[PDB]
Design a protein around this nucleic acid. Sequence first.
RNA 1: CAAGGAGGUAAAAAUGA
RNA 2: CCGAGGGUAGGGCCCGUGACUGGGGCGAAGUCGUAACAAGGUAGCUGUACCGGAAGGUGCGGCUGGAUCACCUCCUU
RNA 3: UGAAACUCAAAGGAAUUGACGGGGGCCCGCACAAGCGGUGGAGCAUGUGGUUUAAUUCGAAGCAACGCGAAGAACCUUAC
RNA 4: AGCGCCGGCCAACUCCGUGCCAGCAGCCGCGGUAAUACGGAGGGCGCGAGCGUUACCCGGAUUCACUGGGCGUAAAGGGC
Lengths: 208, 151, 125, 84, 84
Amino acid sequence: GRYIGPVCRLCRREGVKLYLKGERCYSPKCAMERRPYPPGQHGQKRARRPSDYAVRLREKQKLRRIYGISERQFRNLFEEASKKKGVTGSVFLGLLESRLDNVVYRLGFAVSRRQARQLVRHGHITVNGRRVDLPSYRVRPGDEIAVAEKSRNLELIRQNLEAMKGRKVGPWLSLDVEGMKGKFLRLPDREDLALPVNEQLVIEFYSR
Amino acid sequence: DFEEKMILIRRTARMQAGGRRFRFGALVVVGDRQGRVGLGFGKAPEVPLAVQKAGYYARRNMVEVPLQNGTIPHEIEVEFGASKIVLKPAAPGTGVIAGAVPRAILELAGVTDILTKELGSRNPINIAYATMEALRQLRTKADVERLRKGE
Amino acid sequence: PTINQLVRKGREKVRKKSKVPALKGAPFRRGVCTVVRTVTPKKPNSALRKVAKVRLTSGYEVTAYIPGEGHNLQEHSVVLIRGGRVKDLPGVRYHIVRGVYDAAGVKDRKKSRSKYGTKKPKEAA
Amino acid sequence: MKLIWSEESWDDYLYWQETDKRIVKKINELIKDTRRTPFEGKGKPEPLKHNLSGFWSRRITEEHRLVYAVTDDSLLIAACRYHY
Amino acid sequence: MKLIWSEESWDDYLYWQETDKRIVKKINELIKDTRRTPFEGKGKPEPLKHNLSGFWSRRITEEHRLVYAVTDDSLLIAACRYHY
RNA sequence: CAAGGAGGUAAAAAUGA
RNA sequence: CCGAGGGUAGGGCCCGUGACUGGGGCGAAGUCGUAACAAGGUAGCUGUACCGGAAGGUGCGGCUGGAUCACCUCCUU
RNA sequence: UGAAACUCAAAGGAAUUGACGGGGGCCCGCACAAGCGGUGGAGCAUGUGGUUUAAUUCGAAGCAACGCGAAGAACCUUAC
RNA sequence: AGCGCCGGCCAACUCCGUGCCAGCAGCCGCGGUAAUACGGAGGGCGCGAGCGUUACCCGGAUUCACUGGGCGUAAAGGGC
Ligand code: SF4
Ligand SMILES: [Mg+2]
Ligand SMILES: [Mg+2]
Ligand SMILES: [Mg+2]
Ligand SMILES: [Mg+2]
Ligand SMILES: [Mg+2]
Ligand SMILES: [Mg+2]
Ligand SMILES: [Mg+2]
Ligand SMILES: [Mg+2]
Ligand SMILES: [Mg+2]
Ligand SMILES: [Mg+2]
Ligand SMILES: [Mg+2]
Ligand SMILES: [Mg+2]
Ligand SMILES: [Mg+2]
Ligand SMILES: [Mg+2]
Ligand SMILES: [Mg+2]
Ligand SMILES: [Mg+2]
Ligand SMILES: [Mg+2]
Ligand SMILES: [Mg+2]
Ligand SMILES: [Mg+2]
Ligand SMILES: [Mg+2]
Ligand SMILES: [Mg+2]
Ligand SMILES: [Mg+2]
Ligand SMILES: [Mg+2]
Ligand SMILES: [Mg+2]
Ligand SMILES: [Mg+2]
Ligand SMILES: [Mg+2]
Ligand SMILES: [Mg+2]
Ligand SMILES: [Mg+2]
């Protein structure tokens, strides 16, 4: 399946915090405040200047591990976006953001995208009244993503909803914390989300 | 203010009785990513001197780049010796599709998306001069009618 | 040339030729060894490279390299011929895949053992 | 095949013991391969010219050479030290 | 003269080399006394009979001895270890 | 003052680790 | 009558193989000489002919992918 | 007219900096020529090679190693 | 949870063993005492119910050039 294992090593290697765990990320035990250098025995050796291939590889790997996705689904979304009207990179992020597990993370039903993926897979997440237990379901505008009526009284689900009580969601989303529901209003444009990836370098990475 | 990127640093050799007596050459390119790019070639007995000499020559040798929203206005193809370069304008969202040397020149000039191709000899020195004279030959619709006015 | 000259004679296409005729358009081919020995390399190299003359299925009798450290091959050994040239040895245009019919895998190897045909060792892991 | 040691050879063979033993093991490795195929094998066997003419040389190290000669039944060693 | 080793000769001379330190150089000063005084000297010089037609022997340890025969300018070594 | 076209040539001496 | 096929005789093309023999390439610092690169010690190369262990040498003609970079022999102050 | 097997990781063109020439122009040094005294021949000293030896400790190897490390080997030195 | 790789192309470095041996190999090439190139280990990179290898096709190959090549000396002007 997807990547299972140490996750701080991924952010430490890319040199940027990718926020892949949740509260441990905004903690001082985050380990990018502790050790902001690549992992391994040669971490505190001095950075040899990366090639043009290393630059493109690093930013592609960074964007891929932010969403925690495999590399054929990543590249299938990529040519799905390229054989598509509009700007290839901005479309790409719009199809990546349309994933059900990502909409669950963004709505604050989860602390992490991996927790979001588990909650969707376990049927705690319902889309437009019916169950969708597949974390790759492309959510289209106007869909109401909610929580199952069997899973409404869950200690983890409520604590994350009461933690999301007061914080704002993105302009392409709506959230009803009291109803345990949200709506995919529109596709996110590229000014709406400002992840630390230069979308142009991953376009010209896959352009071999 | 000016981002300067080194591209080719080689070691040459000069024979005299006793052995080789070496010298290093550095080709650098400078830019502001807003329509201005320059390239220099400095040779000194060691590389930090070489890249400093090359940067000094690079800011002397600079060019106008008439960017249009993300790219070049028309496609241009110039032959410099046996080295030849293709530039083709691309729609917004394709990226700098170029090799090693026109990529470093065009993205420091500010190009978002472009289509290139290196033909003939692919020596980094003469391809770089070919791209620079190709960037020098780019005309807009303003310059076109200002020359075809007759006045 | 001129356009009329290309109408008349036209252009020649590349005519690619195979580096592996003994396999006869097959990925692998079974063969029985006939001579198993050690040969020595070419221009700037020195060793005792282990090869075997194999008379195989397509009626060809070729020489093939035995990769790895140590082998169990003799004059009546059944082997599979993989394909691939050895730069330092003349006439050796093929390889012997290990972990097959009578060519056992290399013992005590643990790094890249999909090549050289070695099983997965389990020392409580 | 018989082994014949000269005194120049034997003093240098016993000079290699007491000083650098990996060299006596290389010498033993070259003699063991020379014992089966005398003009083929390890240590780059090439025929010598201009003064050693009629002798063969196997390189022990990048400097040192094993100069030998061979008959139908014997193997005489001329040197096992230096560059000829 | 010169040293001549048989095939068992050197291989078991190589056995003592891979096995023990005092054996091989004790062996070698016997070789050194044997080249100067071929029939007399250190470690039991004796011509023997009925097994040996004109061949000689010398001591290392009473379990292992040193069998050899000497000609014009030659020193052949027949054995490096024990009797029979 | 200044040059070009024309023409008579060293010997006997080989090798490279 | 035609007719599958079988039999006899004679040809054409292709393939495997053969005592021996001819050159090629590889392993190659074996032996012999010094042909070419410096006027490479006879400028070199070439077509052709003859000869010679061998590179090669020579005859005739051709080419510059060589040479008027010093005294001195034929014609000018 | 005109291939193939096989083999090689190059084969090449112009140009650069050197080095070399039994190529040239100009010019030096006891380099030659002019001149004096020598070595190689004898005897002995000292160093080296070789050989011998228990051991003849080790190094230096064309110029630019060879009375050179020794501007002091009877036991000391001294490593054999 | 496995597989390939960590000299350069090509993302990823240290120690030990070995020592022109054993071996690697697509090219350049590496190995004759500290080998980031062999073998192992630690660590790392790339993918992941897969990962590598071989065989074949297209690409890179504007090295058959219509788009899109050349012919004084690099292969190439027919002797006229
Ligand atoms: S931000 Fe989160 S995933 Fe990144 S290093 Fe910190 S704790 Fe780990
Ligand atoms: Mg052109
Ligand atoms: Mg080698
Ligand atoms: Mg002569
Ligand atoms: Mg018939
Ligand atoms: Mg000559
Ligand atoms: Mg003549
Ligand atoms: Mg000549
Ligand atoms: Mg002729
Ligand atoms: Mg004649
Ligand atoms: Mg003539
Ligand atoms: Mg003519
Ligand atoms: Mg013919
Ligand atoms: Mg004089
Ligand atoms: Mg005298
Ligand atoms: Mg003294
Ligand atoms: Mg790298
Ligand atoms: Mg390997
Ligand atoms: Mg080591
Ligand atoms: Mg490798
Ligand atoms: Mg799958
Ligand atoms: Mg292949
Ligand atoms: Mg094509
Ligand atoms: Mg054309
Ligand atoms: Mg061409
Ligand atoms: Mg030519
Ligand atoms: Mg030509
Ligand atoms: Mg003509
Ligand atoms: Mg004709």
